[PDB]
Amino acid sequence: DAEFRHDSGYEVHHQKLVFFAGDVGSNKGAIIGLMVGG
Amino acid sequence: DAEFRHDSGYEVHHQKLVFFAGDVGSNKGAIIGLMVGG
Amino acid sequence: DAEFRHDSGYEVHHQKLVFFAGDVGSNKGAIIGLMVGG
Amino acid sequence: DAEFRHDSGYEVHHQKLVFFAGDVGSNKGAIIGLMVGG
Amino acid sequence: DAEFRHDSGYEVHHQKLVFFAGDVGSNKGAIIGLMVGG
Amino acid sequence: DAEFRHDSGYEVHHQKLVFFAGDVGSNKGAIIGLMVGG
Amino acid sequence: DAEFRHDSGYEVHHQKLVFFAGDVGSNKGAIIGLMVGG
Amino acid sequence: DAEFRHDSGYEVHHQKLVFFAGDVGSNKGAIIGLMVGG
Amino acid sequence: DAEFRHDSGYEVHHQKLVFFAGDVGSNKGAIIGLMVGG
Amino acid sequence: DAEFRHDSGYEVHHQKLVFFAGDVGSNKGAIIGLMVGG
């Protein structure tokens, strides 16, 4: 007579002027805010 | 007599002026806000 | 006599001036807000 | 006597001035907001 | 006089006896290999 | 005098006995290989 | 006179007896290999 | 007669002018706020 | 006269009897190999 | 006259009988190999 209860909790996010908001599992590419050449 | 209960929780997101809002599982490409050349 | 109950939770999103709102499973292409050349 | 119950939850999205709202499973093409050349 | 060149690379996949081969941008439904009740 | 060149690369897939081969942008339904009840 | 060159590299995957091969950007649903109740 | 109860807690985030807000599992690519060359 | 060159490297993966092969950006759902109740 | 060169290196992975092979950016859900109740 087992009982399995899981709750991921309450998440509130307030974000302003955020370039990258989020979780990246794996990153091998390029993440650049601004690129100026020449 | 087992009971399996899962809840992913309450998610509230407020975002303004956010370039990339979201979760990337795997990133091998290029994510650039602005590209200026020459 | 098992009981399987899954709930994905309540998701509320408020977004303004967001270039990319969403989750990318895998990214190998190019995601650029603005491209200026020459 | 098993009972399988799945609920995907309540999703409310409010979006204004969003270039790309949505989830991309896999991305190998180009997603550019603006392209200026010459 | 800018030059923008992007290549997504060479992808070779060999898969045998794979339930789910592919990238999911966002998952809120149920993905179960086998369901047995009663 | 800008030059924009994009290539999505070479994709070779060999798959045998694969239930679901493909990329799902968003999944809220049920994907079950086998369902047995009673 | 800028030059932008991006390469996503060479990816070779060999997989056998893999339940879930792929990258998930965000997961709020249930991913279970086998469910047995009662 | 066991009872398994897990709670992920209450998370409140307030962020302004944040380049990268989020958790990266593994990082092998380049994350640069600004790139100026020439 | 700047030159931007990015390479994501060579990735070779050999996997056998792997339940979940892949990178998850964010996980709030349940990932269980086997569920037995009652 | 700047030159920006990035290489993500050579990655070779050999894995056998691995439940979860991959990088998780953020984990708030449940990851259980086996669940037995009752």
How many Å apart are CA A2 and CA J4, to the nearest integer? 58
Interchain CB distance below 8 Å, B38 and E4: no
How many Å apart are CA H23 and CA A16, to the nearest integer? 18
User: CA neighbours within 13 Å on the CB side: how many for H2?
Assistant: 9
E25 is an annotated ligand-binding site residue? no
Greatest C-alpha distance within chain D: 70
Beta carbons within 8 Å of A22's beta carbon, 6+ residues apart: B20, B21, B22, B23, B24, C23, H21, H22, I25, I26
Does an interface of 3+ CB pairs under 8 Å exist between A and H? yes
The alpha-carbon radius of gyration of chain H (Å, integer) is 19
Short-list B19, B21, B23, CA closest to B34? B19
How many Å apart are CA B34 and CA C17, to the nearest integer? 15
Interchain CB distance below 8 Å, E38 and D2: yes
User: CA neighbours within 13 Å on the CB side: how many for G30?
Assistant: 32
Tokens of G29: 């649903």
CA distance D4 to chain G (A): 9
Short-list D20, D12, D14, H13, CA closest to C16? D14
Please calculate the CA angle A25-A26-A30 and round it to the nearest 5 degrees.
125
B17 near A17, Cβ under 8 Å? yes
Full strand arrangement of the beta sheet holding G24-27: F24-27, E24-27, G24-27, I24-27, J24-27
Experimental method: cryo-EM
User: Chains near G, with 3+ CB pairs < 8 A?
Assistant: A, B, C, D, E, F, I, J
| Residues facing residue A14 across a β-bridge | B14, H14
How many Å apart are CA B20 and CA F38, to the nearest integer? 47
Q: What is the 3-state secondary structure (H, E, C) of A6-34?
A: EECCCEEEEEECCCEECCEEEECCEEEEE
Residues of I in contact with J28 (CB under 8 A): 26-28
Total residue count of chain C as it appears in this document: 38
Tokens of G13: 């995957």
Neighbouring CB atoms inside 10 A of F37's CB total 11
Short-list E26, H6, D19, CA closest to C34? D19
Element (H, E) at C5: strand C3-7
CA nearest to I23 within chain H: H25
How many Å apart are CA E3 and CA E17, to the nearest integer? 44
Residue linked to tokens 């269980």: I32
The alpha-carbon radius of gyration of chain D (Å, integer) is 19
Greatest C-alpha distance within chain H: 70
**Chain centroid to CA B38: how far?**
33
In chain B, the N- to C-terminal Cα span, in Å, equals: 70
How many Å apart are CA C34 and CA I31, to the nearest integer? 38
Full strand arrangement of the beta sheet holding D20-21: D20-21, C20-21, B20-21, A20-21, H20-21
How many Å apart are CA F38 and CA A30, to the nearest integer? 52
Full strand arrangement of the beta sheet holding C11-16: D11-16, C11-16, B11-16, A11-16, H11-16
Short-list G27, A7, B5, CA closest to H8? A7
Beta carbons within 8 Å of B3's beta carbon, 6+ residues apart: A2, A3, A4, C2, C3, C5, I37, J37
Distances from the Cα of E12 to the Cα of D6, E15, G15, G30, angstroms: 36, 10, 11, 29
F15 is an annotated ligand-binding site residue? no
Please calculate the CA angle D29-G26-D35 and round it to the nearest 5 degrees.
25
Element (H, E) at I21: strand I20-21
D33 near C30, Cβ under 8 Å? no
User: Chains near D, with 3+ CB pairs < 8 A?
Assistant: B, C, E, F, G
- Name the amino acid, one letter, at E38: G
How many Å apart are CA D31 and CA G14, to the nearest integer? 30
G15 near E15, Cβ under 8 Å? yes
DSSP at A37:
-
How many Å apart are CA G32 and CA I17, to the nearest integer? 15
Strand ranges inside G1-38, DSSP E: 3-7, 11-16, 20-21, 24-27, 30-36
How many Å apart are CA I12 and CA I14, to the nearest integer? 7
Short-list F35, J22, G17, A37, CA closest to I31? J22
CA nearest to B31 within chain E: E6
How many Å apart are CA E16 and CA E21, to the nearest integer? 10
How many Å apart are CA J31 and CA D33, to the nearest integer? 38
Q: Is I2 strand, coil or helix?
A: coil
Q: Buried b / exposed e across D7-38, counting CB within 10 Å, b at 16+?
A: ebbeeeeeeeebebeebbbbbbebbbbeeeee
Distances from the Cα of D19 to the Cα of A1, B30, C15, angstroms: 51, 17, 11
